[PDB]
């Protein structure tokens, strides 16, 4: 069936990037879309777009890396080095605005779902609202 659609997505992304795929699908949900636009806006993915594959909605995610590196092993640096689910269906996680974590002296980000909607941590700090600590990236 699938137990965590979001966590699965972060993974699909995680997995694709380490073999340096140019693209991945992930079956489509509006909540998935909302997370994607953050990655997109915050510079981790080139972007997503909707497609229908074998007749059903997916989101084609376009990944984004670094320049071919110098010595032995020229594999590019990852743009997404670390994407990680936090609030799993087993143990749901909620920070209030006072407890919103700052991922990696700011160089990171924490997608975080609120009643004002899906937000980065700074977005949500600024809007002054906590919620379900979704995951974190950097």
């Amino acid at each position: 069936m699938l137990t965590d659609p979001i966590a699965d997505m972060l993974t699909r992304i995680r997995n694709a990037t380490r073999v340096y795929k140019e693209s991945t699908d992930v079956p489509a949900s509006r909540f998935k879309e909302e997370i994607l636009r953050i990655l997109a806006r915050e510079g981790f993915i080139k972007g997503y777009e909707r497609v229908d594959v074998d007749g059903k909605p997916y989101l084609r995610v376009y990944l984004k890396y670094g320049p071919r590196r110098q010595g032995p092993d020229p594999r590019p640096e990852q743009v997404i080095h670390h994407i990680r689910r936090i609030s799993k269906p087993g143990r749901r996680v909620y920070v209030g605005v006072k407890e919103i974590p700052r991922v990696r002296r700011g160089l990171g980000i924490a997608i975080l779902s609120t009643s004002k909607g899906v937000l980065t941590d700074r977005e949500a700090r600024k809007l002054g609202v906590g919620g379900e600590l979704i995951c974190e990236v950097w």
Partner: peptide, 13 residues
């Protein structure tokens, strides 16, 4: 270890 600069360069494009 990385810095504001490099991350910036990275995510730019």
């Amino acid at each position: 270890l990385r810095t504001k600069a490099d991350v910036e360069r990275l995510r730019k494009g």
